[model samples]
Target: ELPGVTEEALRLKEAALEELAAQEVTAPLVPLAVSAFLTSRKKAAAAELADWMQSPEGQASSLESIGRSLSRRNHGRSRAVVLAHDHDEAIKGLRAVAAGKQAPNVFSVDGPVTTGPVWVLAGFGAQHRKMGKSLYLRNEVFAAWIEKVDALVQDELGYSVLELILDDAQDYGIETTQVTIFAIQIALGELLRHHGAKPAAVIGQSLGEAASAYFAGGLSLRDATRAICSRSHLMGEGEAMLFGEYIRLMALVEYSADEIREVFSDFPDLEVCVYAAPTQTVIGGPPEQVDAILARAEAEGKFARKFATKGASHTSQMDPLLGELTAELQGIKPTSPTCGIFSTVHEGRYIKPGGEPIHDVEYWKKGLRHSVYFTHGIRNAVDSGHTTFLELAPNPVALMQVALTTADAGLHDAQLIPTLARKQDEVSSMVSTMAQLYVYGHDLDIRTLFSRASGPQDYANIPPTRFK
Candidate 1:
């Protein structure tokens, strides 16, 4: 009878009172404490979530669901669903979310009939200068690693890396950007690993390669940091203008690398650097030459986005930097990884666990110098049975294209999870993503969701969890 109740919600409420309680709950449900367990399929968690809703100190008030997050951009928004033990509690939860106090437990139904392997990725697009501030401040796990990396970077470069990222008074340039992004990516690995969503494999985006290698266990955190810092320093060391007068653009066009090479055959120096999706292509060359190409693409009605990028990679621009980069990246040893690391630079190539070491100095050099085969690696991942892509950025950049890339392979339903959403509340974003993984059947450490562990005295001193 409420003015705002959904027909589906109304239907679920009716069913829970009748068919659901009779079979799934203990005794009659009308007199029991209410818990909201959102579901699109199955009744597996009906009893468990119902109990979790009531008999816990840490449960808090939440919408636990097997369905997708109902939002425009969530990968599985269509299958969205929610559950409630008491009809009024659902409304209460809704009001709390509407007040922006909670992050809605994100996307449902067909309820992920088959769980799939999760592929982790960490690059693409531009990042805001203040990208990691919220996570850095709120997340202890994230803050710890950021502090750790910044300490290493400070030792090497004598600058406070975390301070530089958070300080708006300071200007962030190529080295800071590269170092910060890698730092964020590394911290995300720590944060997610702590939460038990460690990647089955890592897909390397251009700027994301070092972190990808680190997550995939091919490179140690120290070694990865060294390589990333060396790369950034090389780019900015002596250039009068940054990146040798080169620029980059992320283009959404319906052309393959072959078509691009043929159409822009005039600019022989230009490179079709990124093949991220069927249309999410990235291009870069000389600044003038790349700008001219962007103009032509725009005139042709292509959507060319210019990000806050300072330099170019994955093109002819890296041709001369090989020797210099190799020298700078010296003394870093690349080892085999625990998970496979799919390469964007080398299509159909990966550093699989227990395999021979391929990420030597030569490999890192070509990863910069060669055109990026992002789609190729994605296709390889799909063929290798990866259906979920977890993005390790403050924003969804490469993960946004997994669906697009899968579309070409004639597969949809690719699950994309972002660690931190752009401008979303951090606690809720983290909880929602972890909840998403929970419904999908990953065995997350339940206590990990309760923040840092406590001693008996800590819990003993606390009052009962207060709703007020």
Candidate 2:
């Protein structure tokens, strides 16, 4: 044998060179093709996302200026597992399920597992009828609706919100925002644990940053709750530092994050907030600029439509709200997230201990004061190797605006399972999604080349944390 070149060493060198040559011959062209495909597909996807989000009804149901929907359906979507809590109609329904009686009701079951989580809530209606010369605002009858859904969050999930806008008629003289904040915090902690759920990563939207911070271990639940309540109480609804109803209600199209900000920034008060993919972005402040941008986007074929929400939430338009929010945040202590979490404030950047974030609320405030690059957040989550992504309170589907379009981006595993828009209420639909996910997580027996699935044997002797 020559000095260092034993037969085994020579063979290893040959194998390495062979693998490198194969990659050189094939891999480069593969990525180039994928890149080309993604470019065309991503643009087309943004267009579709703009159309869906700006649709009339899509705008109507959103709680924030940002569109939170992952999918859309009016009434007949899917309803396999009706979660009814201890309430009137739901109680009766549960009793029936217990007795195995089939009646003409709105719920059904598959052999076992009665249902999931639902609670009944009742409240507000205002009617205005035109009289000869006078307009009247009359309180209508208190109606009760049996909603086969869980509370907007766990009862313990939100800060007690005691909103007091002197000019607005909807003043709750004595409710506490602090309590509401605490409730939301407590509820989420419990729910995630109960579902046997563990996130590889987490991302929070605008006002939702603090809560996300709490979950990520950046803030203790107690401190985060206190801050949220304090911030909520201080928030007052004031007139246009900026507003965007004009643009949203009219021109109707989706604009890329950078594009929307460029057009809107021309106006003094207008600004952008929370940029997410699926071609979603939020523009705020000046109604005229917002309208102008939306109009021009429509005219230029850049925007397909818009999503509706309460305000220009994440933009500089909320500058006034930031002070109070910051004050609330200041009192809280910072910690790390239990799992990997990203910050949208810095465009989905991660915050680690001893990082600038430990001593600053400026970063947190800045995130709220400007646009959140939500698209990047979703993209990053995929990059983190989480084959399955779950959006907590809001449906994960909201992030699909970017997922499906970007799936061809070539940065992710080819067999990525998109589970954001799944409606969990129905068994069949749930099973389909779960089946795909189950196969990915478990079912590792079959081995075939060019197959679209994976099984356990593929990854052996790695670690248990990789799977069950």
Candidate 3:
């Protein structure tokens, strides 16, 4: 009943208060305790205290937490009996219900019953690596990754990437940048996959496609890392801006395509490159022109923030660089992935499951120059019945984009889980995500949780076997 109390919160408050009334609580303290409990940071603890204050014996608040613990326990146990998809039969069932027919008898089971663990893959590597002190990698995972990187650096660059990664340098040049991003993403993706987080479909953006290939088993570990290294060495950097204001409009204000296009039309040089969401587009072009465009947008009550890089990406500027990329990729042979690899460039069917492989060098080259059809790929994945997206990024950048994209498509029930936390340590973040996945009925291969334990088991003293 208060000014800002949400309907759900009010409902919780009413239920808690009713519980209190049943315990014969004093009248005056009722409103005060409920208000305090609602506003408290430790809501569960507060709820328990309220419960105790009204108790006859005033037992040590044994009821425990409120919404937090209680809801989690309930949600963990709850499972819906999803009826098969049959429109006519569903309508008939509804009519039966109206006529007061028993629930089970009136319904018909048509197709196969399904409780999906469908998940989509998301990538965010370079920016996250640069921003954080450490990656979201398991200790053993990091050791394995470092060993590979050490060998690769010695073989290719005749040095160690250890220093480069530890320092988290922005000015480490594009080659180091590319390798760093690829290495981190590969490690993160593998960690999740190793820990029973297998996705139904995979989608990647910009540099992300390489890691996607690795996850899909299209590229061998060494090949994927080397490909990323070659890509960074060959890629020509270009200016890019955050273009946050436009994203807010499309994501929050629900701006139409025409309205957004018309707004950006005034700035011809600013080509939309990466589609993070329906309205969230990353513009790439000449630095000065990009600045001027951002200035003009700001004057019109819009906002834009430039990316800290030497050149623009995902624009026509990458056309000349494709030749270099193509030449570098001559010997590398990529194969088909185990899962579907949705293309953000062509925006259509890219890699179908068990169909033609995605090893075309020219296709990848053309993809560099084309605007990333990320939103399209996401929509495609949703259409293909992927209801969950596991973003294996160091930060929540791609997670935000996927969240917006899924919401735009009206897939409100879809789950978006991030492997790494913005501020929390990697292990905790990983555990949190794993817990969420477990609650959602995901088929996690639980053995992976203990897969890191490599030591031989100790045999029992009396375990000496007799003759066979």
Candidate 4:
């Protein structure tokens, strides 16, 4: 399920390529490969390439034996003929193939014409904090979210757009909706610029749906922005009424907020807020988990507990807010998708004319009261043939979470990019990692695929940021 390049897989591919280069392997060889390899290219050619490389007096050497073995394993349909004289021409051909500059000449193997689709997706919010980074960082609030929005919009928002929504109602203020929506629109703009983003679909969760509509041509950015702003206004930064509200807002624990509410059902003063994640939800009343633990201890012969937070959220008490906010949402136009815009309202049911009811406005009305189902959006992407995801947001935790959830749902090969946990400059790492993950196949090292380190001296001669 961990689809990104693992160290082992990367090592094998790198080792083989290094060995091949060193042995002066300049011939037509079937590309032999391992079935366990995660690359998209077929294995017949690599296998044949290995067959020829290992032949005695044909160039096989002790040092290159490992590569020969790999080639044999990856061997696919193409057969390669080793010719010392044709080394230069073959090198050009291989380079072309490796660089994605040209397709392999199947005629050499007496095969029919073939082509494979290659798609590219752009990243979003490079300036924001990468995923997993604390929200304290500037622009870190929606950094993780915008990345998937970018991917979704570019893909025409085919399903849901999901990411972690930390339930913290404190430092982030009472309503965090506006910033989240704006970030998503910015991300969609980035995704739409990519070539692969066309003929795609769109969908969003929480504040993302408005942004998705904008990207799908179903709604303008102004309308989406207005809707989000209006929704935020109605909430007016909700109240932080309890001590345990902090935990609920930030999603620092694994227990659901409802579970907390259930534990504190006897306490009218206590409450739960923010139905955040599968395990870690927020509770405002009595630090339900702590109280339960303490209550258990008291029954057994001891009593001690501690709790944190300044607000309560998402309990039945918030039900009124859901209605008022959704009413404001009804003002926006839910137009037909120029391309496609799926819904994450209830884990995505395609709304296309004859399809299920994905485009229903009633769904959005109910979405706020519903839990965020990011897995549905990811699953739909996989169902639609998009195995890779670019989380261009500042954080990677949301992407990692989605990847984990999707893997659990059986799309083990899903790949995602970006991280908010890293330093500001670390944005380059996510970009470079994404490029390598999607562009290079199983035969290349992800690190080698990134931009080479630059020298500070090289920039010394450059002009200042202000320009002349």
TM-score to native of every candidate shown: 0.74, 0.48, 0.64, 0.46
Candidate 1 C-alpha lDDT tens digits along 1-468 = 112323443443354345433664321111111112333212222233333445443244333211111111122311222323343444434333323234243133334425345555545554675577766655788878887887777665656667655554555565677788888888877887787777777887777888888887788888887778877776655232654444443344455667686767877666677787776677766667667777777898776766455556666656667798888778888887787777776784666777776667887888877777888888888887777777777777677677788878877867677776667655556665665554454444433554232433222111232223
Candidate 2 structure quality by residue, lDDT tens digits, 1-468: 112223443343355445445653311100000001232342333234334335563244222111111111111111121122112223343344334444332132222111111110000000111110000011011000000001221122231121111112332211232233233323433333332333444566644555566555566655655444544344323332224442212222366655665665565665555465545565554456566766676787675444433345565445677776676566556664565566666776655433443314675667546767666765665555434443332123333444542473444432323221213321222223322322233221111111232443333211121235
RMSD of each: 13.9, 24.8, 17.0, 16.1
What C-alpha lDDT do the candidate models reach, one value each? 0.61, 0.37, 0.52, 0.39
**Across residues 1-468, which tens digit of lDDT does each residue of candidate 4 receive?**
112323443444355445445775333222212222222242333333334434552242321232233332333333222212243333344333333343433112322113111111111122232232223121232343454332333233121122222212212233333344355445433432331333245545455555555655665554555555554444445444333343332223344444555645555554433233344333444345446544653575532323233333333444666666665556556555664544656655544423333333455445544544444555565566655454434444446445655565576755443433346333334323323232323122222221243533211111121114
Task: Give the residue spans of candidate 2 off by over 4 A.
Answer: 1-189, 233-253, 261-269, 304-311, 352-360, 394-397, 411-439, 442-468
Better of 1 and 4 by TM-score: 1
Would you list the rank order by TM-score, best first? Answer: 1, 3, 2, 4
Q: Residues 1-468, candidate 3, lDDT per residue (tens digit)?
A: 112323443454355445545774321100011111122222333334334334553322112111112222222222211111232233333334333343431321112113343333344333544322344122576546654654564455444555454443324554565565556666665666666667556777777777777777777776666666666666523222234332111111122344558756765665666766776667766556576666765676654566655555667666667777777677767776677777776773557667666746766776667777887888777777777777766566677777777787888876667766556555655655654455455655433433232322211111121113
Clashing pairs in 1: 38-82, 38-83, 67-107, 67-108, 68-107, 68-108, 69-106, 69-107, 79-108
lDDT (Cα, 0-100) at 56 in candidate 4: 59
Higher-lDDT candidate of 3 and 4: 3
User: Which candidate leads the pack in TM-score?
Assistant: 1
Candidate 1, run of 10 with poorest lDDT: 64-73
